[PDB]
Design a protein around this nucleic acid. Structure first.
Lengths: 51, 52, 185, 49, 148, 58
RNA sequence: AUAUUGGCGAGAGACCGAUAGCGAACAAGUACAGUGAUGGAAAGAUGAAAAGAACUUUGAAAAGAGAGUGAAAAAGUACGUGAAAUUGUUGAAAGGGAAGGGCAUUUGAUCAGACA
RNA sequence: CACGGACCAAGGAGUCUAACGUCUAUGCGAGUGUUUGGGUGUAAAACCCAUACGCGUAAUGAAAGUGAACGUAGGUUGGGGCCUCGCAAGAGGUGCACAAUCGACCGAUCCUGAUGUCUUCGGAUGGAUUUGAGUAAGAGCAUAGCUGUUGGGACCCGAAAG
RNA sequence: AAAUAUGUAAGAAGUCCUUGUUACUUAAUUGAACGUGGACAUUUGAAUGAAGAGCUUUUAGUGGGCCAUUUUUGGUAAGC
């Protein structure tokens, strides 16, 4: 019922193990909300300046 | 566990992964499926002939 | 030179597309431009305009209003369309089947309809089930129930709620509101 | 001074207020200071809670 | 966002949206609320009736904790039961098993009778109630217990 | 230092840029200024006849 | 627990970048002014390294021309780059109490684009 | 035959903040707001959170106080969309938002003032050319943005004065 | 007693017939108001046009005016 992502080993060599999707990836993709949230959130490690 | 699903919910108080306002992000399939194509008139031309 | 009977280059005064940068609502708009263009159904033209609408002009439709409208005669089996948001109302306790289609359902309204058995549907699903909008009720919601409309038309002898930040005695109950102090309104 | 239908406003900025502005840039710094205080107290002091 | 402003668009234009005749000036009608009785009287009448004068009685040293009495309507009474138990009590409407509701515990000092709870018995513990609330609850088979 | 006291010049142009519109009459106007005796009786009459329809038409 | 543009010690910035930023990036609270209280500046940059031009010649000297050092003196301590106003020389063009501009063409000068 | 301007460079004038309104976008939605603070941290970021508190869900009245369904939450007139008949024109049914209107409900005011009993308390019931910034199946809360308002050096420069 | 200027109307929220409610009114189920029900429809009740009709919110600048034809006051007149 979910696309069954396969797991991969450190030296390549794809494993015989497969896990379902956690549904975070079927969440909606909203570039506009990511945009607004990013602007406001990247303003938040700012440091004051003044003459 | 962190972000929730239809089964699990926990790790965020009353949080629910948001809900789609459209079942299919591909509109060609919807338009071309069966019933719309039944229910629509025939089409014309992508660019019209010029008259006069 | 021309004596114009009207203003030139006047726009229609109507929103021809949504301001929202929402990919999915633009996709809905694409679908319904196609349908209104190819179906000769008034329903889809209506739904297209209502997609273009703004938020205050898409006020939420209560599930109780849905029930009220399904208590119409011949309308229990109509799919109830809301181009907007369907909110819940615990003030009802007996709620019917209600096939309901809308952009957004709250958790409460979703739960309520699914618990009564009905189905909560997107407008693309509605299109697939109903290209001409067969067997439908469009439900708009209340626009002139707003705190802002409470204030429009503010003048003497019109009764439309001053703009005021602190309500009570000492705040605009005196002169102009009562004959004992000068005059009333 | 007075204009269209707007609410009557009461803003108390007629004193020398920008001689007494306090902006809380010290918020996170004081949080870290407060945590280190609690931790160094709980160390220095005892097995007490 | 300074760049999505109109000072940007008025760069080049002499007066900057303010006129060649008024020649934007500092306080050319006064500051704040100068003139409510003289030269802004028509503003204050029409859009602010009531502003000037006294109204009633003074309360020296008034607490609002005294007057704390937030209200609840019968149409929102059943919202005070957990949703898990609400259907349980709603079905099987039986005295000797009637729900109890701590309205004060929920944060409500008075209970009002707006509209039409179901015909189920309920025990409503409230400091105050209205007459129609009492009537509607007793008609639906409940009772109001008064508390402090 | 004398002024131009009064003139009604340009004022019809101003009034007609937005047009002298009729007040947009309606059916069922306000019964304001209408005699209270009539108003009371008329209330009781409307109540009676609407009651007749509600109490006869099944 | 709270305050803390002074002091001391540390770390940072969607800050300014030498008409900016502290008045002060420099022997700056200096030079200077004023009886005094007080007022109060301007001023950074050769080059990797002085390698800072040995030597000849002219000149009374300053300097110049050469030579030369140097990747470069189209870097010579009047020094990174080196705009403009303003000026010199050369060249070109026009000019009967202004010049300048627009449309259109002559004349002169200069200039790109193209046949597989 | 009004003012300023000899020339060049560089500099140079609607900004920020607190509270706000209209509109818009977004999030959740009869609720919303994590960021006072606590936890955590690859550290002044990101991540997580209890109790509250604010605004909203109930107004009205100077207050004491009281406090929102006669009725499928009313009737009428219109009303898009849908439903039925028809090939259509058109006919009927249902009709959200919205407009107008006659009503009902809540509070204030003025009246009527019953059954009763600290016999002056009580307030049923029924009214009205009266009145509210109300109800009549909630819409708001928060973030952000242009424009606009108020206080502020408040677009920049500018007094005589105190 | 004009000319010019001006109000109203030129029908669907209409006309016709029968008939309900009322606490108003009448000597009187006579009237008044709102109505049920039925009848008249596409030359539905002049002309022309209708670069869409209706509605709302918010906000800028302005709030020194001048000229001409015609009417007209003051003034001998005036680019008053």
């Amino acid at each position: 019922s979910r696309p069954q992502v396969t797991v991969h080993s450190l030296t390549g060599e794809a494993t015989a193990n497969a896990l379902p999707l956690p549904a975070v990836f079927s969440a909606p993709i909203r570039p506009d909300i990511v945009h607004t949230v990013f602007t406001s959130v990247n303003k938040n490690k700012r440091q004051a300046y003044a003459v | 566990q962190v972000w929730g699903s239809e089964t699990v919910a926990s790790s965020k108080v009353g949080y629910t992964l948001p809900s789609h306002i459209i079942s299919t992000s591909d509109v060609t399939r919807i338009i071309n499926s069966s019933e719309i194509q039944s229910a629509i008139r025939p089409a014309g031309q992508a660019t019209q002939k010029r008259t006069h | 030179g021309i004596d114009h009977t009207s203003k030139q280059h006047k726009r229609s005064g109507h929103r021809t597309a949504p301001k929202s940068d929402n990919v999915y609502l633009k996709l809905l708009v694409k679908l319904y431009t196609f349908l209104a263009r190819r179906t000769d159904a008034p329903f889809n033209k209506v739904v297209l305009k209502a997609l273009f609408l703004s938020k205050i002009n898409r006020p939420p439709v209560s599930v109780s209003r849905i029930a009220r409208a399904l208590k119409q005669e011949g309308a229990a089996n109509k799919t109830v369309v809301v181009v907007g948001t369907v909110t819940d109302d615990a003030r009802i306790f007996e709620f019917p089947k209600t096939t309901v289609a809308a952009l957004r359902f709250t958790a409460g309204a979703r739960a309520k309809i699914v618990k009564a058995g009905g189905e909560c549907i997107t407008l693309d699903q509605l299109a697939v089930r109903a290209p001409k909008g067969q067997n439908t009720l469009i439900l708009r919601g209340p626009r002139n129930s707003r705190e802002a409309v409470r204030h429009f038309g503010m003048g003497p002898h019109k009764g439309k709620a001053p703009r005021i930040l602190s309500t009570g005695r000492k705040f605009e109950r005196a002169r102009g509101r009562r004959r004992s102090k000068g005059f009333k309104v | 001074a007075i204009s269209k239908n707007l609410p009557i406003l009461k803003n108390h900025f007629r004193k020398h207020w920008q001689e007494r502005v306090k902006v809380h840039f010290d918020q996170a710094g004081k949080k870290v200071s407060r945590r280190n205080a609690r931790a160094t107290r709980a160390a220095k002091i005892a097995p007490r809670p | 966002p300074s760049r999505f402003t109109k000072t940007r668009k008025h760069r080049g234009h002499v007066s900057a949206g303010k006129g060649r005749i008024g020649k934007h000036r500092k306080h050319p009608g006064g500051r704040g609320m100068a003139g409510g009785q003289h030269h802004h009287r028509i503003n204050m009448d029409k859009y602010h009736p009531g502003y000037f004068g006294k109204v009633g009685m003074r309360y020296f040293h008034k607490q609002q904790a005294h007057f704390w009495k937030p209200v609840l309507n019968l149409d929102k009474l059943w919202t005070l039961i957990p949703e898990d138990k609400r259907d349980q009590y709603l079905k099987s409407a039986s005295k000797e098993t009637a729900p109890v509701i701590d309205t004060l515990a929920a944060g409500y000092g008075k209970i009002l009778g707006k509209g039409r709870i179901p015909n189920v018995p309920v025990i409503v513990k409230a400091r105050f109630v209205s007459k129609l609330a009492e009537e509607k609850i007793r008609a639906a088979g409940g009772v109001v217990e008064l508390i402090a | 230092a004398k002024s131009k006291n009064h003139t009604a010049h340009n004022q019809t142009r101003k009034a007609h840029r937005n047009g002298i519109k009729k007040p947009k009459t309606y059916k069922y106007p306000s019964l304001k200024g209408v005699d209270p005796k009539f108003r009371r009786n008329h209330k009781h009459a409307l109540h009676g006849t609407a009651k007749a329809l509600a109490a006869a038409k099944k």
